[PDB]
């Protein structure tokens, strides 16, 4: 069965992102052809992670998401050993060499406060938390939004464009009521 959401994801995100998203889903035992809403969500989260790491200086961010589980933890161990930072309980998404902290990126369809709470309660104190929403809201640990305003604004704009493209295809309602 070929869903509209699967075909939309493929023409909406660039192929490297789609490829990385497909391998992650299969690595954790889910099918992009069936779990099509989560397919879209993982592509979205991946692109946000990459845009975020592009927002700093040259060697500011180490990218943890988008790797297979073993090498992602391998990079975490190396980061932890040369900087002396506690090994996080769960895999984070980036590491900030400038502020010397792991970052967990969040992309939510619901209101921001709730997701931050669930993410904070679930995650480990040292890891910095940065949530984006499809409505333009954001929340970061200690109100410290790591990047400058233009880089985060660009992430916000893209997320709202994605929402519009789905709404134009009558796929937004199913996506919001799927998280
Ligand atoms: O890295 C994340 N998950 C690592 C894998 C994992 C798997 C199970 C438990 C804990 C961790 C992560 N997960 C999430 C959300 C909330 C926590 C679970 N979850 C998922 O999406 C789980 O499913 C997947 C995750 C990744 C690929 C494919 C699937 Cl199917 N939100 C992120 O912002 C984020 O970075
Ligand atoms: Mn992650
Ligand atoms: Mn994340």
Q: Does any ligand 1 atom lie closer than 6 A to the CB of residue 11?
A: no
- Residue bearing the CA closest to ligand 1, atom 32: 106
Ligand 1 centroid from CA 65, angstroms: 10
- Whether domain 1-179 has CATH 3.40.91.90: yes
Please choose, from the candidates 2, 49, 42, 45, the residue with its C-alpha nearest in 3D space to the C-alpha of residue 21.
Answer: 42
Q: Is 105 annotated as a binding residue?
A: yes
Q: Is 172 in contact with 163 (CB distance < 8 Å)?
A: yes
Q: Tell me whether residue 122 is one of the annotated catalytic residues.
A: no
- Residue bearing the CA closest to ligand 1, atom 14: 106
Among candidate residues 119, 122, 142, 156, the one labeled active-site is 119
Q: Does any ligand 1 atom lie closer than 6 A to the CB of residue 171?
A: no
Q: What is the resolution of this structure in A?
A: 2.1
Q: Is 96 annotated as a binding residue?
A: no
Distance in angstroms between the alpha carbons of the first and the last residue of the chain? 22
After which residues does the chain become discontinuous at a C–N distance over 2.5 Å? Answer: 123
How far, in Å, CA of 71 to CA of 92, rounded?
13
Experimental method reported for this structure? X-ray
How far, in Å, CA of 14 to CA of 112, rounded?
27
Ligand 3 centroid from CA 106, angstroms: 5
Q: Residue 137 — φ and ψ, nearest 5°?
A: -80, 150
Distances in Å between the Cα of 159 and the Cα atoms of 18, 34, 64, 89, 99 are 16, 23, 21, 29, 26
Q: Is 128 annotated as a binding residue?
A: no
Q: Is 155 in contact with 47 (CB distance < 8 Å)?
A: no
Q: Does any ligand 1 atom lie closer than 6 A to the CB of residue 35?
A: no
């Amino acid at each position: 069965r070929g869903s509209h959401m699967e075909d939309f994801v493929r023409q909406c995100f660039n192929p490297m992102i789609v490829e990385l998203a497909e391998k992650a889903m299969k690595e954790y035992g889910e099918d992009p052809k069936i779990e099509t809403n989560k397919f879209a969500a993982i592509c979205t989260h991946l692109e946000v992670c990459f845009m975020y790491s592009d927002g700093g200086s040259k060697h500011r961010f180490e990218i943890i998401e988008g790797r297979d589980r073993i090498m992602a933890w391998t990079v975490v161990n190396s980061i932890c050993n040369t900087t002396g930072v506690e090994k996080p309980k769960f895999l984070p998404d980036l590491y900030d060499y400038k502020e010397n902290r792991f970052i967990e990126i969040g992309v939510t369809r619901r209101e921001v406060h709730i997701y931050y709470l669930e993410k904070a309660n679930k995650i480990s104190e040292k890891t910095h938390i940065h949530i984006f929403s499809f409505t333009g809201e954001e929340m970061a640990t200690k109100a410290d939004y790591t990047l400058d305003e233009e880089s985060r604004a660009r992430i916000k704009t893209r997320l709202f464009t994605i929402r519009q493209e789905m709404a134009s295809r009558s796929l937004w309602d199913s996506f919001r009521q799927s998280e």
